[PDB]
Scaffold this active site. Structure first.
Site: not given
Ligand SMILES: O=C(NCc1ccco1)c1ccc2nccnc2c1
Ligand SMILES: [Cl-]
Length: 283
Positions: A119, A121, A124, A140, A158
């Site tokens: 997140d 941005k 933040n 954040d 397998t």
């Protein structure tokens, strides 16, 4: 409502910083703090943040689990990076370099220690001081993920009964971290230009279409005041194929970031904060 007796016993609560973040004062030290109230994943956020130790990642000072969750953090006096970029506000190419270099170091740290922010941005990214040249801190971690997978465990057997799609997923696997490099690419575009790369303003093409195609809105007039080294890095980070997309390591090796003065400036801001904590040296 009221704050818990436990919180009140250590901190004097004051003015709201963002409507949820409040300014408080530690009674013991009289120092200012920031108290993040998350109304009743937060246990994981605390667990991640208590272990992480880097100058460009926000530190937890204290935590209270009551009617709501209360997280005590160091106060970032410069506020959000978002506030420095809103309304087509443009940051000088030098300030972009300084901030971005720190975001790269921070994210490299996270990835080295197996954490994906998920997140990133401008809202933040927190600036330490009201001054342009300052330390930045990544905040954040609500959305963060922690990297042995179920795929690694499945492949030990397998594939007699294994579904094809599972076998196909093997190619793409272990490249979820590349989502943060996309974000840094989108952040760097915003800082450099004042405008976002992918947007629904004056376009017919859907936001999902621009992003999937990787065809960002390019305005030459705006990008003329930006270097080719800066724009090359954006182009190298805003790559559709996550496997081809630049890593924090590759980004940090890029010509744009080979700026000895910028590196010096951050190093000088580092020791400036470290003078307070500094215990006398052995020698
Ligand atoms: O508005 C803020 N700073 C501006 C400022 C200057 C003086 C007091 O406050 C702000 C917002 C959210 C935060 N979240 C974590 C840590 N510090 C934060 C600071
Ligand atoms: Cl109260």
């Amino acid at each position: 409502s009221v704050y818990p007796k436990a919180l009140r016993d250590e901190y004097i609560m004051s003015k709201t910083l963002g409507s949820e973040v409040k300014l408080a004062f530690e009674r013991k030290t009289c120092k200012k703090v920031a108290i993040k109230i998350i109304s009743k994943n937060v246990e994981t956020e605390i667990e991640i943040l208590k272990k992480l130790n880097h100058p460009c990642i926000i530190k937890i000072k204290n935590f209270f689990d009551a009617e709501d969750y209360y997280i005590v953090l160091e106060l970032m006096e410069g506020g959000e990076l978002f506030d420095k970029v809103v309304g087509n506000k443009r940051l000088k190419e030098a300030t972009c370099k300084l901030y971005f270099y720190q975001m790269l170091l921070a994210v490299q740290y996270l990835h080295e220690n197996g954490i994906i922010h998920r997140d990133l941005k401008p809202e933040n990214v927190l600036l330490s001081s009201q001054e342009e040249d300052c330390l930045i801190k990544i905040t954040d971690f609500g959305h963060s993920k922690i990297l042995e997978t179920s795929l690694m465990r499945t492949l030990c057997g397998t594939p007699t009964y294994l579904a094809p799609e599972v076998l196909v997923s093997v190619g793409t696997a272990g490249y979820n971290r590349a989502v943060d490099c996309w974000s840094l690419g989108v952040i760097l575009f915003i800082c450099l230009s004042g405008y976002p790369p992918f947007s629904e303003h004056r376009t017919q093409v859907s936001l999902k279409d621009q992003i999937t195609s990787g065809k960002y809105n390019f305005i030459p007039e705006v990008w003329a005041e930006v270097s080719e080294k800066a724009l090359d890095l954006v182009k190298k980070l805003l790559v559709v194929d996550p496997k081809a997309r630049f890593t924090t390591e590759e980004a940090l090796r890029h010509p744009w970031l080979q700026d000895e003065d910028m590196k010096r400036k951050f190093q000088d801001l580092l020791s400036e904060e470290n003078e307070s904590t500094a215990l006398p040296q052995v020698l």
